[model samples]
Target chain A: TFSYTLEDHTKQAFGIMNELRLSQQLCDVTLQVKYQDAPAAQFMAHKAVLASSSPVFKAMFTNGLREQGMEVVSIEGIHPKVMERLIEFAYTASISMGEKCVLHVMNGAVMYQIDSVVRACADFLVQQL
Target chain B: TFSYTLEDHTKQAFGIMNELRLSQQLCDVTLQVKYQDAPAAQFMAHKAVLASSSPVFKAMFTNGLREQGMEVVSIEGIHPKVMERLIEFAYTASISMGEKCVLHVMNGAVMYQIDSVVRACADFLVQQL
Candidate 1:
């Protein structure tokens, strides 16, 4: 029975995230997300991750949405970079938010119905105030 | 900028661990760990994971140990089940330690120089006391 510090667990969690991001070996789904500015930007992800992270995605995939059948799903409105960060959050459960990008990310979070991200962004905004 | 609760982060980390365990797509090394009672129990793992989790394993692999050259390494004294749990901890950063197995797990943690596991085990024992 070994004991772990908060820092230890945090480091271990981050290590797993790094491997998931780098390897992409277990990535099963490809998100053909379209941004208003960048038409060609794409993101590869795991369906389990997306579904677990967002209620919106879970409903889309599990509730017989046509998007579930298609390999590529077009995402409208959200910036490509913001979408990428949201995907990263889905995979790793964490994301870095900057002042320039926080509002956009919060909007994406709300759109996806990921309450945690929305809360985090709200907290960040409050801190700024 | 998205905010996340600890639970959210923990869930995401476990999700990655489950994928890694199930897919074996990113696993680069096979641990052919032998126990005193069992002939051998093979554990599939990633080198990066072992290196990140335990200093002992990191040294064994990175410091040019003879075992690094071999695909299988023999582990003596520790039970095969205990070893499996330790490996799980290495990958997941968490494990369940029962009263019966806590001491043995602690020994393994100390041997491997995983301070976090060692501390967790010790705390459990103190609570039992």
Candidate 2:
């Protein structure tokens, strides 16, 4: 079947979502991520948006996880910078990564079970090798 | 001088947002809309996403409005079905409107100050006329 991309709609809406993140207007949840070497950092966003992008979050927010029913969940293992990028992606679906950061960001995606991000990371690594 | 559309990123993120709305997994706010003569209806969504889509919501969710800090705000004027469509558009940036519904939807968008939706309505009406 043929398909239309609805480029305008997608672009406009994505732009708005980005703005919403920057403004933190109506942001619902906060993530307090702690890494081994860095102090715990907090990230604010819509829990609904986060769950939409990551299966891990879908489970975490819905049930059976320690984070369940908690508005502010603590994250570990993933680097703070990597987690920040992941949160950015949840809102805008865009990320900027340097060579060193790419693997960490990819790992974050893997942890979150963000398939597209993980696939993109794999593709990026493939070209590098 | 040139900018990339990042089509893949936008499409993926918008798709996620759409799914989040469908599931209402972590919906942060509810709209209890009451029209002139019909029964009140409730719509669930992420407040962050709604603020991103509409200036009215940006203000309403932020402060200085009756709906401020309101988890369930009552709506009026717009028809329930039209309000439903408005809420749908807030999540996915997609709306379906018939001839008669088009005007109502446009008005709803205008009231909410979602420029893209309002522009689309104007363009649709232009072609019909």
lDDT for B22 (candidate 1)? 57
**Residue-wise C-alpha lDDT for candidate 1, range A1-129, written one tens digit per residue:** 333434356456455544544555334356776775676577765454576567787556543332321155777888888888888776565687667789999999999998888888888889888
Candidate 1: regions farther than 4 A off: A1-12, A15-93, A97-129, B1-7, B61-74, B124-129
lDDT of 2: 0.72
Please compute DockQ, using alpha carbons, for every candidate against the native two-chain complex: 0.14, 0.31
| Model 2 ranges off by over 4 Å | A1-6, A64-70, B1-6, B64-70
Candidate with the greatest DockQ versus the true structure: 2
Give the lDDT of residue A78 in candidate 1: 88
Residue lDDT tens for model 2, B82-108: 888877776665787667788888889
TM-scores of the models, in the given order? 0.51, 0.83
